[PDB]
Design a protein around this nucleic acid. Structure first.
Length: 98
DNA sequence: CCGAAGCTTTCCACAAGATATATAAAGCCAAGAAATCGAAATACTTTCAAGTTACGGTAAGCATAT
């Protein structure tokens, strides 16, 4: 992911909407190294997390309403702290980075 | 009549030798098969590198309420 003349460190998504999303219909959630052979300027390490955190559907999103604090309480009540402990290994897509 | 120059081989002698059984106990040497075991190569288990994906850690620059 460094010292590579073929990678691009941009911030926006130039042609990423077509180069990266086609794999959704092409390959499964495995063998990401097959994708970088066709998409230039993108590395698999960042592409995995980009795909995951961009195409996820089940996330706690929206405005902080009068019912979300109970959701946070029941989330931190499942196993413990969750953010950095080992219990994050079983949390489905509830990684600490988010 | 004085002087000068030419022991290996091939056969008779016939009295011994040679090749022949025959037990017969005894161990060994000696070549041909049958059984046995050591070296190991073409294979199987496991070890060990080597890159690689699932799973996160902090941190930085932009949207919007007060």
């Amino acid at each position: 992911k460094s010292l590579d003349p073929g990678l691009k460190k941009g911030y926006w998504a130039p042609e990423e909407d077509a180069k990266l999303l086609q794999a959704v219909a092409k390959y499964g959630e495995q063998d990401w190294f097959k994708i970088r052979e066709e998409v230039p300027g993108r590395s698999d390490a960042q592409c995995r997390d980009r795909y995951l955190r961009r195409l996820h559907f089940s996330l706690k999103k929206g405005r902080w309403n009068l019912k979300e604090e109970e959701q946070l309480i029941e989330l931190i009540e499942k196993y413990g702290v969750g953010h950095w402990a080992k219990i994050a290994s079983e949390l489905p897509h509830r990684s600490g980075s988010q």
